[PDB]
Design a binder for these strands. Structure first.
Ligand code: MG
Length: 860
RNA sequence: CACCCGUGCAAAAAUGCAGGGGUCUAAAACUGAGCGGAUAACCUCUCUA
């Protein structure tokens, strides 16, 4: 199922001039040159330890059998022939967009007769795509509740503050929007970015500088810019002092929190590991534990230590409920034992495991490999793991916490994560960006960024080894330090999720908490304020207060939900039975019994139905008696504790279902803001390439129309379909007649205003900002893609209900009500702006082909 | 179960086979990671808000 060429070890098959360079897998993603192929002749590079031998070379195929791992044989294609054969006959291929010459001429200073620089440039574009997703998400988080979309680094707070007495309404209203935002309590959910210990809100200067660095990032990543500001993400060393200082202060605090007293906070794990590693010096063990836990070196070593631990401790008896309070320490130190074993004594085994994982053809093969390695690790570490578990008793952890250890930090401090004065402004800004995401988004951003920078570094080293012109342009010299940025980003990914600067739950936080949970309609605003006074006690009982704080405010599900949704809006969206039920049967049985075992005191369909009924009929007053049972201990068998765990299961289920809905909707919108970022970027790229595209702000389909060669005559596309326009397209995607005809037909069925509104509700995330009203009447939710496009099309209907709509748009909106679901034709109608990129158009207009995790059938 | 590309055969211009694709998607292999519905320098629960 997986690629045999990768299993055989073929990292890449490049193409420079008439020669073809085959590269192999090094340490991780490092690429080492293996063979150079010049017209059916192969010259073996990397003679000692070759990853693969190539037993026969043809002009149209390189047969390669694998040395490393299982001896698998593969056939690989000649890149010079990538667009030749059955059509001069050997030329370096162009990218699908046919933008490769312009990308080379823009990132570097000249066209390149090879097939490596474009490979690097597409990874840079992937970087910008991910940042376009996540700066947009951060701005939507700040706007959830025309100002954040015009924030420029060029003006500091000392110049933005002069807009208090601005004689002009635009500047005065911008400053008033800034004040109305900082005065918002919602900044308390952005506490890492906006709250400092003195917890107080950061001063207005830092408050504004965070917003400027975030909004300018969004503007850069979505709007292709002109002038010096086009390279703003890469010329960040020119940031003003205020922005540098705010980047520093936001980045330093997790670093300072973790490495100020690493011995003290990690004393329990350090001591119990010193018990296992008696022969090891305590300073060495402390440095290794920093490397493992803070720096996360156990994840960079080319195999899943987490998978090995899970397969080793599968059924040995540590799945019992007793260790749940211990399980974090137990898993951490099992991973540490495995790690230290792999650097110290099982380095050969780690290499022999990475090789067989790379050479494996199936996930079943990877599973068997991990299982066998975990069997060996268990048989090696039965007593080590038993010692770890025994020395994690509650009394034992208490005594370990009270003990005094004066461990030498000289060897530890050589591994301390660099402070903000050493890391770069780009990675500091990336951390500041990460301050406005959930944890899953945290990973999807920072791990993808380290992947892309690692790819760029590997390409740069390959081109240096081949002697190719590696020099980026003076404006893109940022990527000449790609190795340094990769190191910084991996270091940041190590500790980005490790620190949470959570604040004491404010009164407005508690207001959001019950609003997201549900209140009876008849209760007035003063009544809700009186219930807040009851929670906060204006003898004393903070039981319900603490229950609401722990279960709702401190739940990252609710944290996410107030990051990207008004609590009242989320509560309203909790009332759509089809959409909540859809998440209900997406959560598996294993994760449904977790809630039902507490919400019960028989069939899974009935269980999910009643769970969804509870999500629909949930309110504060069902939990208003939490002052009685919150003081109980969930682990006990008292009825107060049982009811406490029941309410915890209900609240967690509701918040998690809403979290899943909102996260999936935001992810689907993230794919479309990728699409529109690509539209806007490729517009400028094609304009540089001499394509006649024109202004795309006015009409977002200008790019696809320019690529297809069609032009609207009197507002409608009057050019018909013929093979000539298909074959003379501006890119490889639309060289085919069938999908050219389909995209032309769907272009004729769209309109400028609807497409512009779709772009606006995608970038500004208004479809989610108004999720409650955009989800009112939905019949079923076959997938999150369907729900997102129903929200989008309902948003389009609401704005275009009292305006002139073309016949096709009217038919789409009528089909919206004829059966209450999104229009599978409207999606491809307003998705035409990125129809030029046929793969993206197909993915974003066809369900099943949208997401990788739930693949479905193509609708042709 | 997308798109494209190479090759072999049938084709009279596209279908079976076998593959490849970092240079096709959110999308190369190991990882990291997402899907995903607890993970986190900090035992847990209570406490503190
Ligand atoms: Mg790519």
């Amino acid at each position: 199922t997986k690629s045999m060429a990768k299993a055989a070890g073929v990292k890449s098959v490049f193409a420079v001039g008439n020669t073809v360079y085959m590269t192999s897998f090094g340490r991780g993603n490092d690429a080492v040159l293996e063979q150079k192929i010049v017209d059916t002749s192969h010259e073996p590079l990397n003679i000692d330890d070759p990853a693969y031998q190539l037993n026969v070379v043809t002009m149209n195929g390189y047969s390669v059998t694998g040395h490393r791992g299982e001896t698998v044989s593969a056939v690989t294609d000649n890149p010079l022939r990538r667009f030749n054969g059955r059509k001069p006959e050997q030329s370096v291929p162009t990218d699908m967009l046919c933008l490769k010459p312009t990308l080379e001429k823009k990132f570097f200073g000249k066209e390149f007769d090879d097939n490596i620089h474009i490979q690097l440039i597409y990874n840079i574009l992937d970087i910008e795509k991910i940042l376009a997703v996540y700066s947009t998400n951060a701005i939507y988080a700040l706007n959830n509740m025309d100002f954040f979309m015009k924030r420029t680094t060029d003006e500091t707070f000392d110049d933005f503050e002069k807009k208090k007495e601005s004689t002009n309404s635009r500047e005065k209203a911008d400053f008033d929007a800034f004040e109305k935002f900082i005065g918002n309590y919602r900044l308390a959910y952005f506490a890492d970015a906006f709250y400092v210990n003195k917890n107080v809100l950061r001063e207005d200067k830092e408050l504004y500088s965070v917003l400027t660095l975030i909004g300018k990032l969004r503007h850069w990543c979505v709007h292709s810019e002109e002038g010096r500001a086009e390279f703003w993400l890469y010329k960040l060393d020119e940031l003003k002092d205020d922005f540098k200082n705010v980047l520093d202060v936001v980045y330093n605090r997790p670093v300072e929190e973790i490495n100020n007293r690493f011995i003290e906070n990690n004393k329990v794990n350090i001591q119990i590991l010193g018990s296992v590693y008696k022969n090891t010096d305590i300073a060495e063990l402390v440095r290794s534990y920093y490397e493992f836990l803070i720096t996360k070196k156990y994840k960079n070593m080319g195999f899943s230590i987490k998978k090995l631990r899970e397969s080793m401790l599968e059924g040995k008896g540590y799945a019992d409920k007793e260790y749940d309070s211990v399980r974090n320490k137990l898993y951490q130190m099992t991973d540490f034992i495995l790690y230290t074993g792999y650097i110290n004594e099982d380095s050969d085994r780690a290499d022999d495991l990475v090789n067989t994982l790379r050479s494996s053809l199936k996930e079943d093969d990877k599973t068997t490999v991990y299982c066998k390695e975990a069997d060996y690790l268990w048989k090696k570490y039965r007593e080590s793991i038993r010692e770890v578990a025994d020395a994690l008793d509650g009394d034992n952890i208490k005594k370990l916490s009270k003990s005094n250890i004066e461990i030498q930090e000289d060897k530890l401090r050589k591994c301390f994560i660099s402070y903000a004065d050493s890391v770069s402004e780009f990675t500091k800004l990336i951390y500041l960006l990460t301050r406005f995401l959930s944890g899953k988004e945290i990973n999807d951003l920072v791990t993808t960024l380290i992947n892309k920078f690692d790819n760029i570094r590997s390409f740069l080293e390959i081109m240096d080894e081949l002697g190719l012109d590696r020099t980026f342009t003076a404006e893109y010299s940022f990527f000449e330090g790609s190795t340094k940025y990769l190191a910084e980003l991996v270091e940041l990914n190590s500790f980005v999720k490790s620190c949470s600067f959570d604040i004491n739950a404010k009164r407005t936080m508690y207001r959001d908490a019950l609003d997201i949970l549900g209140i009876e309609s008849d209760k007035t605003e003063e009544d809700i304020e009186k219930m807040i006074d009851n929670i906060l006690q204006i003898k004393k009982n903070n039981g319900l207060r603490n229950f609401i704080a722990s279960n709702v405010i401190d739940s990252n599900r609710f944290k996410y939900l107030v990051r990207y949704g008004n609590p009242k809006k989320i509560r309203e969206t909790a009332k759509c039975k089809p959409a909540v039920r859809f998440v209900l049967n997406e959560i598996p049985d294993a994760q449904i019994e977790r809630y039902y075992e507490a919400c019960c005191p028989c069939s899974a369909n009935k269980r999910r139905e009643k769970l969804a009924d509870m999500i629909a009929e949930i309110k504060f007053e069902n939990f208003s008696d939490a002052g009685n049972y919150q003081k109980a201990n969930v682990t006990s068998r008292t009825s107060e504790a049982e009811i406490k765990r029941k309410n915890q299961a209900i609240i967690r289920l509701y918040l998690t279902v809403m979290y899943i809905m909102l996260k999936n909707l935001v992810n689907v919108n993230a794919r479309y803001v990728i699409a529109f970022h690509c539209v806007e970027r490729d517009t400028k790229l094609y304009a540089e390439s001499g394509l006649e595209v024109g202004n795309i702000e006015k009409n977002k389909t200008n790019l696809t129309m320019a690529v297809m060669g069609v032009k609207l005559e009197n507002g409608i596309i009057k050019t018909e379909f013929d093979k000539s326009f298909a074959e003379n397209a501006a890119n490889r995607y639309l060289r085919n007649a069938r999908w050219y005809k389909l995209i032309l037909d769907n272009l004729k069925k769209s309109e400028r205003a609807v497409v512009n509104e779709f772009r606006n509700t995608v970038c500004h995330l208004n479809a989610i900002r108004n999720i409650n009203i955009n989800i009112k009447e939905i019949k079923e939710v076959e997938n999150y893609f369907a729900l997102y496009h129903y929200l989008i099309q309902k948003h389009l209907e609401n704005r275009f209900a009292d305006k002139k709509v073309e016949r096709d748009t009217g038919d789409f909106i009528s089909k919206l009500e004829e059966h209450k679901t999104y229009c599978k034709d409207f999606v491809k109608a307003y998705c035409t702006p990125f129809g030029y990129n046929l793969v993206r158009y197909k993915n974003l207009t066809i369900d099943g082909l949208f997401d990788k995790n739930y693949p479905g059938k193509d609708d042709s």
